[PDB]
Amino acid sequence: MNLETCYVDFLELESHVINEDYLKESVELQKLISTLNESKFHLNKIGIHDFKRIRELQISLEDDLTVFVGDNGFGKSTILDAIAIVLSWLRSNIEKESKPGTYIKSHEVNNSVDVEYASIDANIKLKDFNTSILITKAKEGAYYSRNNELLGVKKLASIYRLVNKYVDNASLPLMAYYSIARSYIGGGVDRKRTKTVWSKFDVYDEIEFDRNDFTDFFQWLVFLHNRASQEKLSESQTTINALFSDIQSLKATLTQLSAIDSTVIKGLELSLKEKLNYMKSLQSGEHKFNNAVSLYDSVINTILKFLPEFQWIKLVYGDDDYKIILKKGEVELDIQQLSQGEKTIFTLVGDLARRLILLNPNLSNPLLGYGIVLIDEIDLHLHPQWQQTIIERLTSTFPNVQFVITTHSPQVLSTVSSRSVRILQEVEVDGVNDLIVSHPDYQIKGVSNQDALLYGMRTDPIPSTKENGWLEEYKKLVELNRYSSDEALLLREKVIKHFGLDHPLVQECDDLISVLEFKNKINQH
Amino acid sequence: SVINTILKFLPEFQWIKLVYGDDDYKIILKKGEVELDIQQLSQGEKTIFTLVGDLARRLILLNPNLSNPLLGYGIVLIDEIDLHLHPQWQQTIIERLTSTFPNVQFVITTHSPQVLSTVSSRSVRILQEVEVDGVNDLIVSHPDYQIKGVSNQDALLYGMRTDPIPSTKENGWLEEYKKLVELNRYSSDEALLLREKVIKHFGLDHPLVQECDDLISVLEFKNKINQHF
Amino acid sequence: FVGDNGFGKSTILDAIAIVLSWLRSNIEKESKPGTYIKSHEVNNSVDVEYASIDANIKLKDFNTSILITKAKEGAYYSRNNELLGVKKLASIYRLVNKYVDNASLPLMAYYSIARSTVWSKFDVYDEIEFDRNDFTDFFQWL
Amino acid sequence: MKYLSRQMPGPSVLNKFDYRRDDWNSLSSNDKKEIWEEIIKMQGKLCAYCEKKIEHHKKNKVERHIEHFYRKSYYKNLTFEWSNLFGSCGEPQRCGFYKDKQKYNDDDLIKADRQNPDVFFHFLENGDVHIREGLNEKEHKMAEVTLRVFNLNPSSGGVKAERRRAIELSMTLIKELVGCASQLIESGCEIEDVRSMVFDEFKKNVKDRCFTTAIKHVFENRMP
DNA sequence: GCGAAAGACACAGATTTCTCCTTCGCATATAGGGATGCGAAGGAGAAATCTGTGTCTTTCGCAACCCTAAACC
Numbered sequence A: 001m002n003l004e005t006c007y008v009d010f011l012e013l014e015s016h017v018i019n020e021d022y023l024k025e026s027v028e029l030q031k032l033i034s035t036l037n038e039s040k041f042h043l044n045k046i047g048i049h050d051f052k053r054i055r056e057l058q059i060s061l062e063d064d065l066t067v068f069v070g071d072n073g074f075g076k077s078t079i080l081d082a083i084a085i086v087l088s089w090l091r092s093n094i095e096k097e098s099k100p101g102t103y104i105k106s107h108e109v110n111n112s113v114d115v116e117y118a119s120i121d122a123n124i125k126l127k128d129f130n131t132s133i134l135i136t137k138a139k140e141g142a143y144y145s146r147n148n149e150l151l152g153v154k155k156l157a158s159i160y161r162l163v164n165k166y167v168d169n170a171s172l173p174l175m176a177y178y179s180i181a182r183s184y185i186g187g188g189v190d191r192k193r194t195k196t197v198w199s200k201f202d203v204y205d206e207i208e209f210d211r212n213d214f215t216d217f218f219q220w221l222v223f224l225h226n227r228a229s230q231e232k233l234s235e236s237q238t239t240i241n242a243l244f245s246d247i248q249s250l251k252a253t254l255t256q257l258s259a260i261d262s263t264v265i266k267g268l269e270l271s272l273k274e275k276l277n278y279m280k281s282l283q284s285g286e287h288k289f290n291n292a293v294s295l296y297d298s299v300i301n302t303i304l305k306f307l308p309e310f311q312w313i314k315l316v317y318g319d320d321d322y323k324i325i326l327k328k329g330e331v332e333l334d335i336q337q338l339s340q341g342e343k344t345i346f347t348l349v350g351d352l353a354r355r356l357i358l359l360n361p362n363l364s365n366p367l368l369g370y371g372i373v374l375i376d377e378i379d380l381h382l383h384p385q386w387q388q389t390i391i392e393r394l395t396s397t398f399p400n401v402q403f404v405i406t407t408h409s410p411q412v413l414s415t416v417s418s419r420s421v422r423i424l425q426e427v428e429v430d431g432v433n434d435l436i437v438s439h440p441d442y443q444i445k446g447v448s449n450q451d452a453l454l455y456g457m458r459t460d461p462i463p464s465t466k467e468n469g470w471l472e473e474y475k476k477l478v479e480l481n482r483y484s485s486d487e488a489l490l491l492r493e494k495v496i497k498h499f500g501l502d503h504p505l506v507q508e509c510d511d512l513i514s515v516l517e518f519k520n521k522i523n524q525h
Numbered sequence B: 001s002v003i004n005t006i007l008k009f010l011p012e013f014q015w016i017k018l019v020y021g022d023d024d025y026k027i028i029l030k031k032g033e034v035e036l037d038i039q040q041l042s043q044g045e046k047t048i049f050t051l052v053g054d055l056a057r058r059l060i061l062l063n064p065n066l067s068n069p070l071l072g073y074g075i076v077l078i079d080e081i082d083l084h085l086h087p088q089w090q091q092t093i094i095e096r097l098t099s100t101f102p103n104v105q106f107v108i109t110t111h112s113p114q115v116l117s118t119v120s121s122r123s124v125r126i127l128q129e130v131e132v133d134g135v136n137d138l139i140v141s142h143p144d145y146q147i148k149g150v151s152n153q154d155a156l157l158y159g160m161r162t163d164p165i166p167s168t169k170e171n172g173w174l175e176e177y178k179k180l181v182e183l184n185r186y187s188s189d190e191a192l193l194l195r196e197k198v199i200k201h202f203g204l205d206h207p208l209v210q211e212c213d214d215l216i217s218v219l220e221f222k223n224k225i226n227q228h229f
Numbered sequence C: 001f002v003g004d005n006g007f008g009k010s011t012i013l014d015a016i017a018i019v020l021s022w023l024r025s026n027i028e029k030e031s032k033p034g035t036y037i038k039s040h041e042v043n044n045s046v047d048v049e050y051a052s053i054d055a056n057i058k059l060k061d062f063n064t065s066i067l068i069t070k071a072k073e074g075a076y077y078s079r080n081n082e083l084l085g086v087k088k089l090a091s092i093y094r095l096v097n098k099y100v101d102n103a104s105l106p107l108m109a110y111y112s113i114a115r116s117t118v119w120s121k122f123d124v125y126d127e128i129e130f131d132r133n134d135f136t137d138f139f140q141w142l
Numbered sequence D: 001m002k003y004l005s006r007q008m009p010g011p012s013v014l015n016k017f018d019y020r021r022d023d024w025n026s027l028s029s030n031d032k033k034e035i036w037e038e039i040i041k042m043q044g045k046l047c048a049y050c051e052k053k054i055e056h057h058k059k060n061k062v063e064r065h066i067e068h069f070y071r072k073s074y075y076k077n078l079t080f081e082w083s084n085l086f087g088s089c090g091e092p093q094r095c096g097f098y099k100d101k102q103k104y105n106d107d108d109l110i111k112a113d114r115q116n117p118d119v120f121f122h123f124l125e126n127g128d129v130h131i132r133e134g135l136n137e138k139e140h141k142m143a144e145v146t147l148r149v150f151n152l153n154p155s156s157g158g159v160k161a162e163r164r165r166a167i168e169l170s171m172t173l174i175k176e177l178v179g180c181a182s183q184l185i186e187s188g189c190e191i192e193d194v195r196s197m198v199f200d201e202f203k204k205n206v207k208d209r210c211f212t213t214a215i216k217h218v219f220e221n222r223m224p
Numbered sequence E: 001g002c003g004a005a006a007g008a009c010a011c012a013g014a015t016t017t018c019t020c021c022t023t024c025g026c027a028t029a030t031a032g033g034g035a036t037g038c039g040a041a042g043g044a045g046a047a048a049t050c051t052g053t054g055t056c057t058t059t060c061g062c063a064a065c066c067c068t069a070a071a072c073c
C-alpha cells in the first residue's frame, strides 16, 4: 500500500464526514498510522555548488553509518553545516505551517569573479516515498534572482501534522548536531546561577547542542526522580482528589481576582493549565501509566553501559539542594571531580537518551525511534582502548538512527566496514583545485591499525628520522653483497650504539648477512 | 624577529606578508609557487601558528640583550599535544619543537601512539595502578625497548601495552581458521564452512588470505619433495 | 607521560603550576601570596588529614627546595609552608635586575586545556595560563 | 614493469575509425568494452607502470583509463594506432595522470614493448630502486629520467610504502623456500636439478600478484 | 482578479551591561587625638539592543485563443 495513495484517500474522506469520532475510528486512519510506523526516514544524496570554498561536489550517504577521512583547507566541517541547513526547514514546517527556516547569508557565497549564485540540493527517502529540496541564494546586484523550492518539504510535513492532530501519542523524528564546542559545554560545573510539564515540542527549539541543555538535563532528572517517589509512596486516588480540590480552589481564586494584576492573572492561568495537565496525566496513569521508575532505571543503565569502571549513580538531597553522587571503586565523587573524557561521554549519552525518551511517549522501549545524528570529532579526549569500542556500543544501543561522523584516528577506522568510508582529496586539475572522493581498495574491518593507516588514510606508517636514514643506508649496503667494507663497519657501530644488539630489527639483518655469506661460500666453491 | 621565527619553524613556506588591496586587505603566504590566505589553513595549522607565535613573543620580550633571543632558559608544560592534528603532522612536531628552542625544558603529556615513535626511550614514563598491602596506588614504569624508529603498532604494543588488533567477531573466524591450519586439519567440513565465511567477508585477493593460503602450498611442496627422494 | 584516563596525568601539571606560582609571585614582589589548594582537591579517604607538595630547583650547582601544605578540617597539618629557599632566589634576581638594566629572566609557561612594563607597553599580559584556538586575537595583534 | 608480450593485432572497432573522424570522444561504449577486454587479456589485471591492481574479482570499481604512449597533440598520426594504447590506474599522483603535466623528450623514454626493463632497474628489500652500474651514458639517461617523469622513486610514502608492505608480507615464503634449498644442498644432489624445481614452484605460486617483479628480484638474490 | 515565496508593520519580553547606592576603611594635613574628605568592593536596579509572533503585499506565463492590411481601447 503506497503511503501517498492512503494519504489522499484519507484527505478526500475527511471532507465529507464532519463527525470526529468516525474519523478517529475509520479504517483509513488505521492504515495511515500502520504504514507510517514501519517506514525508515533517511537522507539519500547531497550536492554542493559554489558554497564557501567548495566549487562542485556530489555525495551519496549510507543508510547506517558514514565516515569522512582526509585533511584539506576547506575543512570537512562545512559539509555538515550544509546538511544542518536543510533539516532546519523540515523542523520549522512541523512547528507551524509555512514558517521560515534558515537562509544562506550573502558573505557565504564564493568570492570568485565568475560566480553568481550558490545552491544546495538534498533528497529524503522514506520507504518508496522520495522528496527533494533545493536552497539557493544569488549575489547582490545580480541580473536574475533565484528562489527556494519548498513543495516537497511542506507535503512531507503535512502528513506528520495530520497524524499528530488526531492521535495524542504520535512519534516524531529526531535531528541533532554535536560540534567541537561541546567540550566547553561539558566543562559546566555547578549551577553557577523547573517546568511542571514536558512536551515533545520542547526539544524542537534548536538543532545544535549548547550549554543550556545540560542545565535542563539536571532539571529533568530531578523531576523524573520525584515522580518515582510517588510510585514508592503508593499514592491512591485521594491524591488526585486533593489535586482536583486545589485546582477548583485556584479557579475560584482566579474568578474572584477577575472582578474588582495582569501578571498575576497570567500566572494563575498557567497554574490552572498545569493542574489540568497533571489531572490528565493522572487519568493516563490508569491506562497502564508509563512506569517512571522504569524510565529512571533505563537512563541510569544506559549511562552506566558506557562507564564500566563505576558501580552506581545516585541523587542525594542535602543542604536544601540535590547533588549527583558517583561511586567508583570504593570512593564517592561529585561530577565536577571527573576527567574530561568521562564528562564528555556522560553528557553526550545523557542528551541523546533524554531526546529519544521525550520524543516517543508511546513506544514501550523509546530507544528504538528514528532520526539522524551528526557528530564531529568523535575521538575527542579518548584513549586508544576506548576508541576501539565506541562504535559497537553506539550502533547497538540505538539501532535505528543514521549517523554521520568525521574522524582523525586509525584505531576508530579499523572497526568500520570498507563500504562506509569516503576519502577526500584535492586535485590541481586544469590549474584549479578540485575535490574528489575515493574508496579504500581492500576491506579494513579487523586488520591492524598500521594497515588501516596505510590504506584508509594514505600515509607512511614509519617516520623518517636520521636513524632511519642510517638504517636504510646499512640495509642497502648489506643487501648489495658489499657488506664487508670499512664504511659498513662505521655505520654498524652507530646502529648498534643506538638501537642495541638485542633489538629484533637487528636480528633480521644479521640473518640476511649469514645466509648471503653462505651463498657466497657455495658459489665460490 | 617574530616573522623570522615562524618562518624558521615551518620551512615549507617562502614568505608571509600583509597586503592592502583596492577594496580589502589580507595576509598572503607563498609556498612553492602558490599564494594562500591565512583563512585557508586547517585547525591544526592555526593551532601550531598561535602556539609558536606566543612562545616566540614571550622569548623575545624576555631576553632584550642577547644577540639571538632564542637561546633563553625556562620550562614549558603542554597537555595533550596531539589535539586536532592529522597523523602526518604528529610525526614531525617533536623534532621541530626541540630544534627551534634548544635550551628549554619541556614536559608533555600525550595520547597518540604516532607521537611516541619519535621519542627516545630515555624520556618516557608510564603510569600504572597496582594494589599493595590492600591499598591501590599508582606506579611509574619505563619501556623495555628502544621505540625511536619503530612502526606504529610496535610503538602502540610496547610504549602503551595495549592490543594493536581489535577483538571484532570477524577476526574470530580468522584466528580459528589459522589455528586449524596449524594442527593439519584443512579437510574437515567445519574448516570448509569457516573458509567460506572468511572468503566471503574478505575476498580472494586480500593479502591476509593469500598469506594464509601460502602455508598450504608450503606443506604440500614439503611432503612432495620429501617423498621424491 | 603516557597513561589512560583518570590516572593523574593532569594532576602532575597542576602540581607544578602551583609550585611555580609562588616563585613568580615572589619574583614580581617580595612577600606576595601565590595560589592555594582548593578544598575539594584533597583526598576523600577516611584517614587523610592534610596534603603537601615538595619541589627542588637546581641552577648549575645551587639548589633550592619548597614545600606547600593544607589541612582538611581542623586537623594538625605540618605547621605552615617553607618558602625560605625561594625568597633567596627572588632576592638574587631582584638585586641583579635593580642595578643593571636589560637583564634576563627565566620563562615559565603552561598551555592548559579548555577547562574554564614591556608587556603592558604593546598589548601583552603577565599571566601563566594561555589557551590555544584563539587565532583571532593573535591575528589582530599581528 | 615487465616485458609485455604483444599479440596479433585485434583493434576491431578501432579499424572502423580513421584520421578524418579524429574525435577520440566519439568512441562508443561497446568499442571501449572490446578494447578493455583485449587489454585485460594481454596485460593481466595490473597497471602498466606501477603494477597496482586495477580490477577486482568481479559495487565500486577501481578507476582505470586508457593512455597513449606518445602525446596526442604532437603525434596525432598515432591517435588510433594499436601500438600506442595502454592501460593505466586512476592514481592522481603517478602514472598517466602525472605524465601529462611534465616536460620531457619523448625520444628518451623506455617502452615496455621494445626493451626489457630488467636490464636497468634493481629493486631492494625495503622498496627502493637502484640503477644498475656499467651502463652507457645514454642508458643511464633513460633510466634516470623515466623514474623522474613517472614519480616511481619518491623519498617516502607513495608507491614505496606499498612495495615494502607487499615484500614483508611475502617474505615468509622466500625464507621457507631458501631453507628447503639449503637443507637439500647439505645432503647431496645436482644443483641444476633442485634449482629448476624450486624455480618452477616459486614461479607457479607468484602468478597474478601485486608487484610480482619486486618479489621476483628479491627472490634470486637470496637463492644460492 | 491574484499562485508561491520573502519583507514591511505593529507589539511584546528578555537579557547582559552598566551606573547609582551602601559601608567601613583609610589618610593626611593638623605631640597624640580627632575630623573632613576620598578611595574600595559588593549590591542594586535601570536601559538599550535584540529577538519572536501574527496580519498583509505582491502579481503568476495562470486545461478551454486565431492565423488579411491600418489606427484606438
Ligand SMILES: Nc1ncnc2c1ncn2[C@@H]1O[C@H](COP(=O)(O)OP(=O)(O)OP(=O)(O)O)[C@@H](O)[C@H]1O
Residues within 6 Å of the ligand: A328, A331, A337, A338, A339, A340, A341, C004, C005, C006, C007, C008, C009, C010, C011, C040, C041, C042, C043, C044, C045
Ligand atoms: N577528591 C578526590 N578524591 C579522590 N580521587 C579524586 C578526587 N578528585 C579527583 N579524583 C580522581 O581523579 C581522577 C582523574 O584525575 P585526572 O584529572 O588527573 O585524570 P586524567 O585522565 O589524567 O586527566 P586529563 O584528561 O585532564 O589529562 C578520577 O578518576 C578520580 O578518581
Ligand SMILES: [Zn+2]
Residues within 6 Å of the ligand: D047, D048, D049, D050, D051, D052, D088, D089, D091, D094, D095
Ligand atoms: Zn599505475
